[PDB]
Design a protein around this ligand. Sequence first.
Ligand SMILES: [Zn+2]
Lengths: 49, 286, 519, 287, 53
Amino acid sequence: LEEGKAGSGLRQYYLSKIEELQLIVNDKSQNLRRLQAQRNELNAKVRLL
Amino acid sequence: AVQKVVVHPLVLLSVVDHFNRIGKVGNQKRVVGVLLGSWQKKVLDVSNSFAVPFDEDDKDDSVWFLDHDYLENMYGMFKKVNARERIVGWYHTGPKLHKNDIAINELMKRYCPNSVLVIIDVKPKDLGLPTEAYISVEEVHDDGTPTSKTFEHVTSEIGAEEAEEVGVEHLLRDIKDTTVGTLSQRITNQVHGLKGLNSKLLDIRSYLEKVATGKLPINHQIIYQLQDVFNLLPDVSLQEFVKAFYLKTNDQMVVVYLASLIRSVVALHNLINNKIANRDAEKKEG
Amino acid sequence: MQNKQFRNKVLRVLVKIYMNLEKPDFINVCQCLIFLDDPQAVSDILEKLVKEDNLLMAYQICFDLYESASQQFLSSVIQNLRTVGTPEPKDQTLKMIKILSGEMAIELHLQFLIRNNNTDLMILKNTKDAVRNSVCHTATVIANSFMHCGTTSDQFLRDNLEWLARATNWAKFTATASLGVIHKGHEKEALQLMATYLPKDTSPGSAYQEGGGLYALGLIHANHGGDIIDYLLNQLKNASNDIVRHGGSLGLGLAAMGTARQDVYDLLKTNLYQDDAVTGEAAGLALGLVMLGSKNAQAIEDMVGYAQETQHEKILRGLAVGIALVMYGRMEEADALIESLCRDKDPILRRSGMYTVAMAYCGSGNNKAIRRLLHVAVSDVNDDVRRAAVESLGFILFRTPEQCPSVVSLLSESYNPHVRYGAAMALGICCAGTGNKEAINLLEPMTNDPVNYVRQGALIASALIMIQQTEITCPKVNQFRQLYSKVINDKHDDVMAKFGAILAQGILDAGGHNVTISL
Amino acid sequence: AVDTAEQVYISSLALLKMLKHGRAGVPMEVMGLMLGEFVDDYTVRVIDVFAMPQSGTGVSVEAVDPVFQAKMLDMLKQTGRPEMVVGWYHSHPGFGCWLSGVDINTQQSFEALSERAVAVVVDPIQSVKGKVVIDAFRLINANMMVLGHEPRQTTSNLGHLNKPSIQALIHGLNRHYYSITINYRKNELEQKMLLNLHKKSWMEGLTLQDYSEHCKHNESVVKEMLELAKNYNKAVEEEDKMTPEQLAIKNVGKQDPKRHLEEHVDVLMTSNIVQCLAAMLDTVVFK
Amino acid sequence: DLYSRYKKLQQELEFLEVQEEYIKDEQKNLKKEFLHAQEEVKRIQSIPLVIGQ
Ligand SMILES: [Zn+2]
C-alpha cells in the first residue's frame, strides 16, 4: 500500500497548497469587494446628493 | 463668402423621421427636404427644417417634382410662428450626386438666395461625418470648360446650443463626456488608425480605379496638387528632429519623475494605515 | 459538475449490477432515472414487475416516477405501460390502471389537508383593518387564497358580498382566481360551483367572473388526467372580448401544459394574430407551458419574427416568457441561440435571453453563462436586464444555498435600487426552503431604505425564508416583529410598501403552516 | 365604468420639438398640438408635434383657430402624416407646471373628442441642464369622487412616477388633478445614427486633424500647465511637510476634509497625456 | 469523504475563480459610473448665480 497516505497524501497536501491559492483568490475577492463597497458607497453617496 | 456652417442634429433626426414615415412602400428614393437656417450672419446655423413631396422617374433622371404653394404655406406659417429663421437651401438623402441636382437646386437659386447642398447617407454605416456643406456657386475653370454650377466642400460641425445636448444626453445614457484621462484618450489612439484606414483605403481604391479606367475629365488638374502635397513630406531623415526627440523625451522624463514621486507620496497613507490599523485592530480585537 | 457526456453512460452501465444481485434497489434506479431519462432503461423494469409478481414493491417506484422526474417521459410511459398487458390478467389490469391514476395523492392531500387546518381571527381581522379599496384589495384576497389553499374554505368569503364585488375592475378577476387557488382537484364541484353563482340569465354584467372561471378552472385541472380541454375548445370558440381569450388562453394553456398538441398551437397562433398585447401575452404564457420539451422549428423563428414587428410591450414580455419556458434541457443546443439573441437591440428580448437561459442551465452545469449574466448586470445601462439578470443566477445556483449570499452580498446594497430589488428576488429564490442565515443576517440592512423597491423585495425575500422554521432554533424575533410592524405602520408608509408587506405576510400563513415550497 | 393602466410613449421627435419649443418658450403663453395614433386602450404613441403662433390672449380656446388647425392637419393628411391629434401642450414658466382654471377649462372642452387627451407641460426655464425630466398630465372625472380616485392597475411604475416629489404641487394640488408615467423608445436607426452623430459631434472631421495639435502643443502650451501643475504639487507638499507632525502626534480622527490624494491622481492623469501622445508622435514620425 | 474533497472542492475552485473577471467588470465599470455621476453633479454648478451673505 503506502499510497493513500504517501501518494494521495502528497496529492492532498498539494490540494492544501491549492487551498492557499484559493486563499489568495479568496482574500483578493474579499478586499476587492470591500473596496468595491467603498466605491459603491461613494458613488451611491453622490447619488444621494 | 461662408467659411463654416453649423448643422444641428434636429434636421438629421428629421431625416430619421424621413426614414420613419415611409410606410413600407418600396421606394426609399432621395427624398428632398427644405433646409432652413440663418443666412444673416456669416456663419450658417440650421435650427429646424421640413420636407416637400419629391418624386423622380425610374429611367429618366431629369424628372423632378417640387411644390411652390406648399413651400410658401409651410414657410409662411413657420415664419408666422418663428420669424427669426428663413429659407436658405435644401438637402437630399441620396449618397450619389445626380445630374438633375443642378435643376433641382436651380429652382431655389432663382426663387431663393444661394442654396447650400448637403449630401448624407441613407444607412448610418459610414464612420465619417455624414454632413457635407456644398455651396452652389459658379467657378471659372482654367482648362476652358464653360462655366457651370460647382459644389465646393464647406466644412461643417455638429453642435447644439442649449437644450439638444441635454435631450441627447438623457436619451442616450450611454455616451460619455470629454473625460480627459486614460480611456477617452486611449480609445481615440486605438481606433484612430481605423478612422483613417477606412477613409483612405475606401478612397484610394476607386481613385486608382479611375486613374486608368477614367474619362469625362474628373479635374485631373487637382491631382497634381494632390500628389504634390503627398510629396511635400519626402521621408525626412529625422536628423534635425533628434533634439526635438530629446525635448519631448525630456518631458517624458518629467512625467516619469512626477508619476514616481507623486505615487510615492500616495503610498504614505496606504503603507501607514495598513500597519497601524491592522496591528491595533488585531491587538484590540480580543 | 458533470457535462452529461459520460455521466449517463456511467449510470446506464452501473444499473446493470443490482439486477444481477439477490434483490433490486430503488434508490439507484430513482437517482438514475431522474437524470438519464432514457426509455431503454425503463422498458426492462416496467416488464419485470409482472415476472416478479410483487405488488407492494412496485407501488413506491410507480408513485414517485409518476409523481415527478418527468412530464413527457411520463406521457410516453403511460402508453408504454398501456400497451403492455391485455388489450394474472385480473390483477395486472387493476395494477396498471391504479398506478397511473395519480388522483389518490390528491385525495389523501385533500384529506389530511382538510383535517389539519388552523385559522386565526387576528390575521384576517388585521387584513380587514388594513384593507384599502385601490391597491391592497388584491393582496387581501391573494393572502386569503394562500391561507385557504387546498382546504376549500369558502366560508370566509361567505360572510358578505359587499367586500368583493363592490368595485368593477380586475379586483374581481383576482378574487375569482384567488378562489381558484382556494379549492383545487374537483371534477364536479368546480364547474358546478362556478355555474351556481348566477344560473339565472346566463349573461354576467362583469365578464371577470367568466374569465376567472376559465383561469380558475385551469388552476384546478393543472396536470390532471381528466381534463375538460375538449369542452374548453368549444367554450373558447365562443366570441367574447378579452376574457375568454385571456382567461381561456391561460386556463387552457395551463391545463394543456406538456401535451405539445398542435391544435392548441394553431388556435393559440390564431389567438395571437390579432396583434393585441393582453391576449398575446396570455397566448405566450400558454404557448410556453404547452410547448414544454416540444422545441418546434418554426415556432421560435415565428415568435422572434413576431416580436420586432409590433410596438406593444406586453406582447414582447408574453412571447419572452413563451420562448423562455419552451427552452428546457437544451444546454448543448441553445448556445448559439442565446448567444445570438443576447446582442439584440430590444431590452425586453435581452431579458428574454436570460430568462430563457435560466431554466436551460439548471443544476449548476454551466459556469459560462454567469459571465454574461453578471457582465450584463453591471455593464448594461438599462436596469431591465440588471434587475432581470440575477434571477437566472439563482435559478442555476439554486443547488448550494451557502455560495449565493457570498456573491450577492455586494448586490444587496448595489448602486441603483433595481439591482437591489432583483438581488432581493435572488436571495428570495436561492434560500427558499432552507435554513441558511447568510441572507437572514443581511435582511436587516435590506428592510430599511428610503426606496420602497428594496423594502418590498426585502419583505418578500424575508417571507420566503421564515416559512417552515421554529423560533427555538434561530432568533427570528427581529424579522417577525419588523414584519408585523409593517401593517400597523402602513399609515406612514407607501401604498405599495403595505401591498408587498401584507402580501409578504400571506406567505407564512399560507395553508396554515401545513404546506410549504421546495425547489 | 372601467379604467386601465395607460402609459405615454415619448419618442425623440416630440422631445426635441419640446426642446426647440422650450427654447422658444418665452414667458408669453405658447400653444402646441400633439398627434399620433390610438392602437388600443392602455397605450398612446406620439409622432407628430408642431408649434402654434403666439397671441396676446395666450393659452385659451379662442386662440385655437379651427381653420388654421384643420388647414395644417389637412396639409399633413396630403403628406405622409396620416395621424390624428392626440393632445395639446404648452409651457408654464415661473409659477410652476400646474394648471390654472383656464387651462383645465380648455382641457375640459378639448377632451370631448378624445377620451385620453394627453397634456404635457414643458418648463426648461428654471430646470437645470442636468435633468430634462418631463411629466404628462391627466384630467380626472368629477363623478369619481365617491369611488376610488385612480383605480389604475400595475402599481409598480408608481415608484418611477414618484420622482417628481415636490411637496407643494403634486400633493399640494393633487385633488382632481393627477399625472401619468412616461417611458421612451429608441430603434436601431436612432441609436446608431444619433449615437454615431453625437460621437462625431465630439470628434473631428477626418479624426486625425486635432491630434497633432495637442501632440505638438505639449511642448509649447502644456509646459506652462505642467509648471503650474508642479506649482500646485509643491503648494500641497509644503503642507504635507507639516502633516507627519500631526500624524505623529494624534493619529486619532480626521479633521481636514481635504484628501490630498485624488487631486494628485488627477494631476497624474493630466500628466499622462504626454505619455499617451508620445506614441502618437512616434506614429506620425514613423509613417 | 477523504478523496471526494478534491473533486468536490474543484467546484469551489471554479465558483471562486469565476469571480475574478466579475470583480474586474465591477471595478472597471463602477468607476466609469463614478466619473459619469461626478461630472453630472459637477456640471450642475453653473457660473450665472446670485451672491448672498
Ligand atoms: Zn402665466
